[PDB]
Design a protein around this ligand. Structure first.
Ligand SMILES: Nc1ccn([C@H]2C[C@H](O)[C@@H](COP(=O)(O)OP(=O)(O)OP(=O)(O)O)O2)c(=O)n1
Ligand SMILES: Nc1ccn([C@H]2C[C@H](O)[C@@H](COP(=O)(O)OP(=O)(O)OP(=O)(O)O)O2)c(=O)n1
Ligand SMILES: OC[C@H]1O[C@@](CO)(O[C@H]2O[C@H](CO)[C@@H](O)[C@H](O)[C@H]2O)[C@@H](O)[C@@H]1O
Ligand SMILES: [Mg+2]
Length: 579
DNA sequence: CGATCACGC
DNA sequence: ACGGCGTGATCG
């Protein structure tokens, strides 16, 4: 049992200068979502407040907004954004249990207070699905049941703060929480709430044109197949290609015949249809995902989309982006790239500004592996893909063709993360003997990288985990497994996580540094998006010459490595034009 | 619901 | 079995 006051009014003792606070949003997507209840636990007791009451009370709202009144929460970004949608500011969050749990072990997939609690054998709180129900049974329960749940969550946060901080400190991860992840949560909240403005007319025009083209390509595909079928069914397509047209079966998966883009390209010498199928799939993706899917989530009266950056999901410390995902907007092909013309500034006479790290992962690799040859390339800003091409093809610089550089690109990206001769040969559609030579030559050229791959795997085996530059960890209990497949996957994770995760660390610290400076010089410029190794902003056009100086320097000096960090930048009237 | 396929880093 | 991390449309 747990005593608590189900309050009908806000009182002075509820406004202490340290509390656990719960501002409950039950909708998975919290943008413009109902707040269903509020709990406060502090030195003076435990309290449930109806939102209708607390959020209309001047003293409570002032307390929420006072940075000197410290709050411990779980997913303070959820609450801060839901409050923003109700026009209320939340300040003074000093501890976020979700971010603490994520840092202690991202593999646990902690997604509610109960799951965090279990890490410390705290059982005096129910799981959120046990109270609200799963999927179609999802509902806010009767007030006494809700109140007790919210109070129990607040009480768990209250008790768990110290145990979590003690373990983070033990791990030398406490500053990762308090100086990096928690300040970032604030910054992301602002990004999600501001949203990104979309030219829906343009998307609607594109959609109309795509539907025409889809129809044309579809009938042409039925013509060359001599049958009608569901092209979006890999199974039905496989029957057509490998049974009706008797094309060679190049790859069989655990389920059937592969019709992947790689396979279809390799089939091009056998039938023209595969080019049409590839074209259909590319148009089809644009339509369903980046036209239909985008327009479904745009808010019609403001024309904004409000993504959610999940800060506590990826195993390497990257962010993810959902509903809509704004981290996979097309760029590689010109047709898809045009989607970016529909991403526009939120005010007139504002511009989109985009800045990206040049090969952050390879630079981080150079730093961590301490390979002399790789480090010198970045110190001297030589094209690393051309350099590798020269080494693996054994030619001079002028003899490197664009196709050779593309092969070298896959070599540079793949080898340090454990690509084999088979994977390289399959990806590049080249001789497996030649792929194996590529690998031998790469390692004889960057021997520090070979030593890194050996050393980090051995460290993972000995410690049970790998670490990034700013002390993020990933545990790899699979790494000393007898079984080749299980062990091998773990070994490749040991090679990759310190590099991808350190890159994540660097850009997160860059975001925090940047917001400080923008707030410092009182510039209207603000962040809209992060795309793993790039930051996207909007600002009044007058602010562009400043941003060209400020943004790249802040990003490049976020950390100091054994090699320089390099940032490119562009701006224009749309995201497309910021090229 | 887990796989397949396409998009990004 | 045979580079890493994601989201999501779509299928059977
Ligand atoms: N108690 C600690 C110590 C370190 N770190 C992480 C976050 C730091 O940003 C990173 C850097 O490690 P250092 O021990 O080198 O600390 P700093 O470099 O931040 O301090 P300084 O460089 O001023 O010595 O390690 C942490 O999370 N918690
Ligand atoms: N198959 C891929 C493609 C890309 N990336 C990562 C590494 C790259 O640094 C980053 C950006 O991709 P680019 O193709 O732009 O890589 P570069 O900028 O190095 O190539 P280029 O010099 O041709 O722009 O995404 C990856 O890991 N695997
Ligand atoms: O609010 C983000 C935060 O909530 C969690 C659950 O604690 O995820 C929920 O919210 C996400 C954003 O809407 C959804 O994508 C997800 O499906 C839902 O469980 C955390 O995972 C996340 O960090
Ligand atoms: Mg590039």
């Amino acid at each position: 049992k747990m005593a608590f006051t189900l309050a009908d009014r806000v009182t002075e003792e509820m406004l202490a200068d340290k509390a656990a606070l719960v501002v409950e949003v039950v909708e998975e997507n919290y943008h413009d979502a109902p707040i269903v209840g509020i709990a406060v636990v502090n030195e003076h007791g435990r309290f449930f407040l109806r939102p209708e009451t607390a959020l209309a009370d001047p003293q409570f709202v002032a307390w929420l907004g006072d940075e000197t009144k410290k709050k411990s929460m779980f997913d303070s970004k959820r609450a801060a954004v839901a409050l923003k949608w109700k026009g209320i500011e939340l300040c003074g969050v000093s501890f976020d249990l979700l971010l603490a749990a994520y840092l202690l072990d991202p593999a646990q997939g902690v997604d509610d207070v109960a799951a965090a609690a279990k890490m410390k054998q705290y059982e005096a709180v129910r799981p959120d699905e046990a109270v609200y129900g799963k999927g179609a049974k999802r509902a806010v329960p009767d007030e006494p049941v809700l109140a007790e749940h919210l109070v129990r969550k607040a009480a768990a946060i209250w008790e768990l703060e110290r145990p979590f901080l003690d373990e983070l400190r033990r791990n030398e991860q406490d500053r990762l929480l308090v100086e990096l992840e928690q300040p970032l949560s604030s910054i992301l909240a602002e990004m999600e709430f501001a949203g990104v403005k979309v030219d829906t007319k343009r998307l609607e025009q594109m959609g109309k044109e795509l539907a025409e083209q889809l129809g044309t390509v579809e009938q042409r595909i039925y013509e060359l197949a001599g049958q009608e079928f569901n092209i979006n069914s890999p199974k039905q397509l496989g029957v057509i290609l490998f049974e009706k047209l008797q094309l060679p079966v190049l790859k069989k998966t655990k389920t059937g015949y592969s019709t992947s883009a790689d396979v279809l390209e390799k089939l091009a010498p056998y039938h023209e249809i595969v080019e049409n199928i590839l074209h259909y799939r590319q148009l089809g993706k644009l339509q369903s995902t980046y036209i239909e899917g985008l327009l479904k989530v745009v808010r019609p009266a403001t024309k904004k989309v409000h993504t959610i950056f999940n800060q506590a999901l990826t195993q390497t410390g990257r962010l993810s982006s959902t509903e809509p995902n704004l981290q996979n907007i097309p760029i590689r092909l010109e047709e898809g790239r045009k989607i970016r013309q529909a991403f526009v500034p939120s005010e007139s006479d504002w511009l989109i500004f985009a800045a990206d790290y040049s090969q952050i992962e390879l630079r981080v690799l150079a730093h961590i592996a301490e390979d002399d040859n790789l480090m010198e390339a970045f110190r001297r800003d030589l094209d690393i893909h051309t350099k590798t091409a020269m080494d693996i093809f054994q030619v001079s610089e002028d003899e490197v063709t664009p196709n050779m550089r593309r092969q070298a690109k896959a070599v540079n990206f793949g080898i340090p993360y454990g690509i084999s001769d088979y994977g390289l040969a399959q990806n590049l559609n080249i001789s497996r003997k030649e792929a194996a030579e590529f690998i031998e030559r790469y390692f004889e050229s960057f021997p520090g990288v070979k030593r890194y791959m050996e050393n980090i795997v051995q460290e993972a085996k000995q410690k049970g985990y790998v670490t990034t530059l700013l002390h993020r960890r990933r545990y790899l209990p699979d790494i000393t497994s007898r079984n080749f497949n299980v062990r091998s996957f773990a070994e490749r994770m040991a090679m990759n996580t310190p590099i991808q995760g350190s890159a994540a660390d660097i850009i997160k610290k860059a975001m925090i540094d940047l917001n400080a400076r923008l707030k410092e010089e009182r510039l209207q410029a603000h962040l809209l998006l992060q795309v793993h190794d790039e930051l996207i902003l909007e600002a009044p056009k007058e602010e562009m010459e400043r941003l060209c100086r400020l943004v790249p320097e802040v990003m490049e000096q976020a950390v100091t490595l054994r090699v320089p960090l390099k940032v490119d930048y562009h701006y224009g009237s749309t995201w497309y034009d910021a090229k």
